Design a binder for this molecule. Structure first.
Ligand SMILES: Nc1ncnc2c1ncn2[C@@H]1O[C@H](COP(=O)(O)OP(=O)(O)O)[C@@H](O)[C@H]1O
Ligand SMILES: Nc1ncnc2c1ncn2[C@@H]1O[C@H](COP(=O)(O)OP(=O)(O)O)[C@@H](O)[C@H]1O
Lengths: 52, 44, 50, 226, 248, 157, 277, 400, 95
């Protein structure tokens, strides 16, 4: 599909759980994908803070 | 077993140049000399 | 043998040895190509044309 | 010369340039749902100096025919004024047919003074028209030179390509109720750069009851919970 | 200096603008008309079949232009719309004047006269559209006519006007048989030639639009074959293809 | 060519004639401001008077279009006067055709339509003068609008 | 004797490897495409074994015919560090000089430096205006440039996918380029890196102004919403220059005035979208 | 830099049958026996030497003084005793050469040797083999003869008279004191024009021939299209007086455009220079210029005038007998059939030219060789007509 | 002369020709056991052998990101999507 908010939230949660399990490189890859997806939403004030 | 001499034709003077490949550069009597799309328009 | 390379001398420039080809390796590829394979078996769909 | 002109060997170069201009940048999606049609568009005014209740992108040409457009708003006005006069003339001649959807196809066809008589310079706007006075809805597109296209869902903006891709992927579908306007707003979201709000987004709906340009109250209501 | 259009000759003496428009008519669109006893039919190729259309106009290429005829354009839709409107207006004006349906040849001559005028005088573009007509009259019965943007119409009985019109007409010449031709075998021939000229085999009934004109009891009936009938024709053609291929 | 010489669409998909005509407004050396308020609408432009042999009494760039609508022009003064005359004619003709006075938004819409006709066709040329017209409208408060050589009429506060 | 080193023979840059200058995701240009560039790094990112077996033929030549927008070198300074690989500036303008006889030799030497390190990428700059323009006739040393390009073609053909090194040219306009490099079989992947793309431009502004931690502690009332929605080109290079134009050290922070001055300097007035909309 | 070339080839083209038979075989045997005997004679003359005289006086005096190392450089100027030569890398030597000094072959602008050390000229390379700047005499005196083209007897007689006013009976208009280089202006359908070349080969049986086809609308600032052809027919006067065949260019390069000024310069330069060279009052020479074309209408008034450019000749389409003759010529090499299907292919034919005749003759052989390979393919009788249709005559929409 | 010998023209490949070109280009590569390459080519509207090559390399690249020797039909259809990105952009459809 082409949902974007759900994709950003899913990727951020995946990065969070990689960090919780100390999976740093996969966490970094997932976070980069999260940025690439999150370019779409222009002012998601909560979501941008979550990404940062 | 002739050649694969491939010249586009869109190279820019058009004189000379081709003379070498026409006779001397060939490097082989058998010669297919394939020219690409003829960039020279009708009446040029 | 013409169209090959040779070694010469310093002042009199007399021949030393008829060297193998040097012109061909240097400028082999200018705008031409020698024979590739690209056999007609790879050519397909155009049999009625070939 | 003084018509839709400049057609070379197998081309309509002036028309093609007009379409390049109608590429525009106002997304202006349209969706034909079972109950009715939604024409949503983006009103991204430069700065806060401009107003949003002053000028509109969605125009009710008649009782249940609503209209949205693309680039060249100055041309779009004139076009919508002509369309209103045409629908009114048809209604006056064929008196009292409450003509909207048996008139939506007809007004799309009379959108030939639209372009087949270009006027030296062809119009630079592609417009979506919605009607529901037949028991069934109708969404048509008229482009700076072509004719009625009879869409089910499309967009006419700067990112109309991926907008249409989004529409088909999100399955414009056929069972969708009238509240496919949520999907329309989603499609805009894709071709939108900002936290869209009630004045930022203008949408009209044409259902079997009639046509209506949704006020900022309802637009904000729909934008909430997205 | 001001721009002036080109409605002029060639140093040789050719109207190359008109010739370019006529050749461009081959580009885009595909229609074909086959004439047969007790029924003459048109087949059209649905160029754009995007799933986001609704098909509510009920007809894009085939246009009903009169009680006793129907046409099919293959040109720029902008000119096609106005030309069909003028054609219907001409036919109905004749009906008003003579209280009798207009003969197909007279209708086609009027239309080609208007196109000849458009290419003749003034700084006006030629009507870049070529169209077929199928009709029935009292004098000549079933008739088929093909008009090019040059205004030089021709009375055909099996022709095509689209992109691969050359291939379609070659197929028609190869598998056309006059006299024996009937409505059903005419339909088989039409679907066969359309399958030939449309590269994708097993043409969907949505990508093909066909309309048949038939003569009922003292009345002309122009029926646009709907999806089910078209695909049943497709199935019968497919059975014939499989049988012919396997019997070798 | 002549894409940039006549009012025709550019191959890139733009209209260069009106794009030029907008810069004609900047040409002429003047500026004008309009501010809508809580209840009033006030506009102001500088009065560039070179040498005092002129009549400062009549060098103005603001005019009454009707009894309640006031306009400020910006750009070439000849086109500015022509459009002011056209706006006054439109206001009077509107008051004649329909009893009530012409709303400022409607007047700006008609002026914009005239300008849009000008940018259409090729015989005439757009007028290089952007007009800011203001007026009090009932049930609306003060209202300010701007018609431009293109035909886009809007502008507020 | 034979001198082992080859890069410093004519300078022309050297081993930009083993050094994070701009990593990868830190770029402000997001993608433009960058997927064809990850495709181009697939060969440095091993995957030469996976090029076979699967039966694919990995690309070899990547020309980017874009203006200075996106940097056009933030992809080669990166990638080379994303997957550790040598990076060379080459610089076409410097190469065309009196050392046209040594031009062939320096091409051989740099090709040898690349072959020495299978993780290496050649990056050639400023081809369009000087190196082998095809529409203006040969003026004097232009034949020398053409011979140098011929030797470059000879070297790229002798490479013939012998190792996993990669070659990328960066050009503003590929029209004047010679067909020999342009034809498939020598260089295939053409990528265009367009202008800042106003949404992507705002993204670039955020990325750069964050690079220098919030523009070195910028004040809150500075937001780029106003100076970014200009529709005034302002390539990523100009964006970086504006970001560094916070060098006004009268105070320890940055205000919106600094951004306004940065946008005011070096700019061309382009406006008037309301007619089109 | 070029005077003549050694013509010791083209061994007796007159092989009478040109088809495999006893007569042709015997002619070839005599030819090869002559070759054998000539090789044997020269080899015996060179081997069984008349006398052994020292080092042929070569290595004794001149070879050693010439020396082992040498370098090649152009010879620039000439003085009474010394010679002024421009050797390599822009060197210049004024030295007298007395060993292997052949003054006639030396010439300015020719490659000579330099013995190094004490740099003085010691020899010349008369071969050189690089006179390639403008080459138009490479095809000089074409071997094509009258018999190659038939059925054009009137035109052949006319052109033969127009070009045999010189050579033959020059004293005629020498006593008449006119010496007219009028040239010949040739008409003809576009379907021919290489037929104009063929009728020019009749003259080309005598002296050389130069060709300028299409050239250009001499945008060149120096102009010098006609001026360089003037230099080249001066070169032809130095050689055997050659003709200049400017078919087509006399039409485009010299077009009767009603435009006066602001027009490609050729109208200024080219036509004026053409007239200047075509008037015998300016340039001498037995050079005869053949201005052929396929558009008589575009004849410029200057070219129109028989006063300077006389001998207007019209090339018409072939008649029935001319078609028979040309088809006989073209199919004679290929033994079309044993039924000799000759008149059926031309009796109803109209507007068929030499190029079409050659094309149909070639395509008949092509189609036979395709699969119908039967030597004198019996199918040829009707396949000559089959590829005589071949469509391709003309196609332009319908317009009718 | 030099062209009157022949004027042979190239017809764009039909659906079956495109199937044959698919076979030629995919004999070398590895893929799944089952594939309806005839339908795969027929899905491509017209195009050319260059486009068949593009589809083959796109299938290879798409299978690369999954890192498997068996190019699936889904990856193949993703490669068919390389015939897309051209379309007609805007629905001109003026004919
Ligand atoms: N994050 C970034 N994204 C894009 N561009 C950047 C970024 N950071 C810096 N740049 C700029 O990119 C520029 C590269 O420009 P340059 O190499 O001159 O262009 P070209 O490669 O076309 O010659 C640098 O000058 C730098 O200022
Ligand atoms: N009447 C003829 N007899 C013999 N050969 C001819 C005749 N006419 C033409 N040819 C040959 O055919 C060739 C083509 O002649 P022509 O028709 O003039 O060609 P084009 O139309 O291209 O000028 C000429 O080179 C000539 O050798």
């Amino acid at each position: 599909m082409d949902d974007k908010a759900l994709l950003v939230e899913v990727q951020l949660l995946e990065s969070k759980t990689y960090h919780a399990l100390s999976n740093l490189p996969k966490a970094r890859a997932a976070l980069t994908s999260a940025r690439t997806t999150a370019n779409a939403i222009y002012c998601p004030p909560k979501l941008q803070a979550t990404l940062d | 077993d002739c050649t694969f001499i491939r010249v586009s034709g869109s190279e820019l003077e058009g004189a000379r140049m081709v003379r070498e490949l026409f006779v001397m550069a060939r490097e082989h009597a058998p010669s297919i000399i394939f020219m690409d799309e003829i960039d020279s328009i009708g009446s040029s | 043998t013409p169209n090959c390379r040779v070694a010469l001398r310093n002042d009199s420039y007399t021949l030393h040895k008829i060297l193998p080809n040097k012109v061909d390796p240097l400028v082999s590829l200018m705008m031409v190509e020698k024979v590739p394979d690209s056999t007609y078996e790879m050519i397909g769909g155009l049999d009625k044309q070939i | 010369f003084s018509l839709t002109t400049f057609s070379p060997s197998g081309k309509l170069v002036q028309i093609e340039y007009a379409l390049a201009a109608v590429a525009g940048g106002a997304p202006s999606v349209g969706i034909k749902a079972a109950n009715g049609v939604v024409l949503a568009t983006e009103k991204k005014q430069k700065s806060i100096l401009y107003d949003e209740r002053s000028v509109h992108k969605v125009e009710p040409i008649t009782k249940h025919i609503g209209l949205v457009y693309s680039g060249m708003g100055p041309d779009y006005r004139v076009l919508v004024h002509r369309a209103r006069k045409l629908a009114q003339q048809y209604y006056l001649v064929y008196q009292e047919p409450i003509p909207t959807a048996q008139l939506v196809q007809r007004v799309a066809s009379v959108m030939q003074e639209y372009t087949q008589s270009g006027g030296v310079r062809p119009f630079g706007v592609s417009l979506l028209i919605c009607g529901w006075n037949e028991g069934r809805p109708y969404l048509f597109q008229s482009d700076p030179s072509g004719a009625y296209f009879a869409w089910k869902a499309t967009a006419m903006g700067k990112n109309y390509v991926n907008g249409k891709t989004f529409l088909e992927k999100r399955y414009n579908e056929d069972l969708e109720l009238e509240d496919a306007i949520h999907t329309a707003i989603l499609t805009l979201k894709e071709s939108f750069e900002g936290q869209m709000t009630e004045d930022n987004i203008e949408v009209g709906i044409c259902n079997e009851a009639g046509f209506r340009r949704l006020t900022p109250t309802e637009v904000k209501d729909y934008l909430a919970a997205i | 200096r001001y721009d002036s259009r080109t409605t002029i000759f060639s140093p040789e003496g050719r109207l190359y603008q008109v010739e370019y428009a006529m050749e461009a008519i081959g580009h885009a669109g595909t229609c074909l008309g086959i004439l047969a006893n007790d029924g003459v039919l048109l087949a059209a190729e649905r160029r754009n079949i995007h799933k986001l259309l609704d098909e509510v106009f009920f007809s894009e290429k085939i246009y009903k232009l009169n009680e006793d005829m129907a046409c099919s354009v293959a040109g720029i839709t902008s000119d096609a719309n106005v030309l069909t409107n003028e054609l219907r207006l001409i036919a109905q004006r004749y009906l008003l004047q003579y209280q009798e349906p207009i003969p197909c040849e007279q209708l086609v001559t009027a239309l080609c006269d208007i196109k000849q005028a458009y290419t003749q005088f003034g700084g006006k573009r030629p009507f870049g559209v070529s169209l077929l007509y199928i009709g029935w009259d009292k004098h000549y019965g079933f008739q088929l006519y093909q008009s090019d943007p040059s205004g030089n119409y021709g009375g055909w009985k099996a022709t095509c006007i689209g992109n691969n019109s050359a291939a379609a007409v070659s197929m028609l010449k190869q598998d056309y048989k006059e006299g024996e031709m009937t409505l059903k075998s005419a339909l088989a021939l039409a679907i066969k030639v359309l399958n030939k000229t449309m590269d994708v085999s097993k043409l969907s009934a949505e990508k093909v639009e066909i309309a048949t004109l038939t003569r009922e009891n003292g009345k002309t009936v122009i029926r646009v074959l709907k999806q089910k009938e078209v695909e049943q024709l497709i199935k019968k053609h497919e059975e014939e293809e499989a049988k012919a291929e396997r019997e070798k | 060519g002549f894409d940039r010489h006549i009012t025709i669409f550019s191959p890139e998909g733009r209209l260069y004639q009106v794009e030029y005509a907008f810069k004609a407004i900047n040409q002429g050396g003047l500026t004008s401001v309009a501010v809508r308020g809580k209840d009033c609408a006030v506009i102001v432009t500088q009065k560039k008077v070179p040498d005092k042999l002129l009549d400062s009494s009549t060098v103005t760039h603001l005019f009454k279009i009707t009894e309640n609508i006031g306009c400020v022009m910006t750009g070439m003064t000849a086109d500015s006067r022509s459009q002011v005359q056209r706006a006054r004619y439109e206001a009077a003709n509107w008051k004649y055709k329909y009893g009530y006075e012409i709303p400022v938004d409607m007047l700006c819409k008609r002026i914009a339509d005239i300008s849009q006709v000008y940018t259409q066709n090729a015989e005439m040329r757009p007028l290089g003068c952007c007009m800011i017209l203001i007026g009090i409208d009932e049930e609306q408060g003060p209202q300010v609008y701007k018609c431009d050589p293109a035909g886009y009429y809007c502008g507020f506060k | 004797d034979v001198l082992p080193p080859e890069a410093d023979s004519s300078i022309m840059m050297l081993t930009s490897d083993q050094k994070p200058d701009v990593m990868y995701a830190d770029i402000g240009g997001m993608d433009i495409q960058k997927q064809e560039v990850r495709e181009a790094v697939e060969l440095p990112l091993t995957h030469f074994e996976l090029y076979k077996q699967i039966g694919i033929d990995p690309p070899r030549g990547v020309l980017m015919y874009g203006p200075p927008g996106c940097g056009k070198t933030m992809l080669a300074k990166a990638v080379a560090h994303h997957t550790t690989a040598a990076f060379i500036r080459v610089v076409g303008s410097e190469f065309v000089q009196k050392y046209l006889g040594e031009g062939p030799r320096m091409v051989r030497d740099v090709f040898r430096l690349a072959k020495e390190n299978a993780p290496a990428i050649i990056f050639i700059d400023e081809i369009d205006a000087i190196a082998t323009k095809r529409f203006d006739a040969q003026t004097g040393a232009d034949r020398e440039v053409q011979r140098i390009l011929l030797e470059l073609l000879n070297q790229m053909d002798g490479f013939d996918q012998n190792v996993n090194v990669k070659v990328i040219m960066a050009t503003n306009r590929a029209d004047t380029l010679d067909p020999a490099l342009l034809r498939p079989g020598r260089l295939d992947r053409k990528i265009e890196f367009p202008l800042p793309d106003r949404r992507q431009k705002r993204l670039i502004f955020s990325t750069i102004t964050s690079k220098m931690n919030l523009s070195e502690e910028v004040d809150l009332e500075d937001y780029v919403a106003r100076p970014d929605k200009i529709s005034g080109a302002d390539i990523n290079s100009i964006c970086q220059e504006s970001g560094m134009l916070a060098v006004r050290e009268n105070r320890y922070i940055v205000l919106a005035k600094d951004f306004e001055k940065a946008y005011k300097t070096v700019i061309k007035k382009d406006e008037q979208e309301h007619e089109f909309y | 830099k070029k005077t003549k070339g050694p013509d010791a080839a083209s061994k007796l083209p007159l092989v009478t049958p040109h088809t495999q038979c006893r007569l042709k075989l015997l002619k070839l045997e005599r030819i090869k026996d002559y070759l054998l005997m000539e090789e044997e004679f020269i080899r015996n003359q060179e081997q069984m030497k008349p006398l052994e005289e020292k080092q042929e006086e070569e290595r004794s005096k001149v070879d050693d003084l010439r020396g082992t190392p040498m370098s090649v450089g152009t010879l620039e100027e000439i003085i009474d005793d010394h010679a002024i030569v421009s050797t390599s890398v822009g060197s210049e030597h004024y030295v007298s050469i007395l060993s292997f000094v052949d003054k006639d072959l030396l010439e300015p602008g020719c490659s000579v040797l330099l013995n190094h050390k004490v740099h003085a000229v010691i020899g010349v390379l008369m071969d050189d083999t690089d006179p390639l700047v403008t080459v138009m005499k490479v095809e000089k005196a074409p071997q094509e003869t009258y018999a190659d083209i038939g059925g054009l007897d009137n035109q052949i007689q006319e052109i033969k008279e127009s070009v045999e006013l010189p050579l033959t009976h020059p004293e005629y208009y020498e006593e008449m004191g006119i010496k007219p280089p009028k040239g010949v202006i040739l008409y003809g359908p576009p379907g021919t024009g290489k037929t104009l070349l063929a009728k020019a080969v009749a003259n080309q049986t005598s002296a050389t021939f130069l060709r300028v086809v299409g050239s250009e609308l001499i945008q060149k600032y120096l102009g010098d299209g006609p001026k360089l052809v003037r230099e080249l027919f001066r070169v032809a006067e130095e050689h055997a007086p050659s003709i200049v065949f400017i078919d087509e260019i006399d039409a485009i390069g010299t077009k009767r455009y009603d435009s006066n000024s602001g027009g490609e310069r050729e109208i200024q330069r080219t036509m004026l220079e053409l007239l200047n060279q075509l008037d015998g009052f300016d340039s001498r020479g037995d050079v005869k210029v053949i201005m052929a074309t396929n558009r008589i209408e575009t004849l410029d008034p200057a070219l129109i005038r028989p006063g300077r450019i006389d001998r207007k000749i019209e090339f018409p389409l072939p008649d029935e007998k001319t078609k028979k003759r040309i088809f006989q010529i073209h199919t004679s090499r290929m033994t079309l059939a044993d039924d000799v299907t000759l008149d059926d292919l031309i009796m109803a034919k109209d507007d068929l030219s030499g190029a079409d005749i050659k094309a149909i003759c070639t395509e008949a052989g092509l189609m036979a060789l395709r699969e119908r390979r039967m030597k004198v393919t019996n199918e040829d009788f009707k396949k000559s007509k089959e590829n005589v249709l071949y469509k391709k005559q003309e196609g332009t929409p319908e317009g009718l | 002369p030099g062209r009157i010998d022949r004027k042979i023209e190239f017809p764009p490949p039909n659906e079956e020709a495109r199937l044959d070109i698919l076979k030629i280009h995919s004999r070398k590569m590895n893929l799944t056991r089952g594939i309806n390459l005839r339908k795969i080519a027929e899905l491509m509207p017209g195009a050319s052998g260059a486009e068949v090559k593009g589809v083959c390399t796109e299938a290879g690249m798409y299978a690369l990101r999954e890192r498997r020797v068996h190019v699936t039909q889904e990856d193949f259809e993703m490669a068919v999507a390389k015939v897309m990105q051209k379309d007609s952009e805007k629905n001109m459809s003026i004919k």
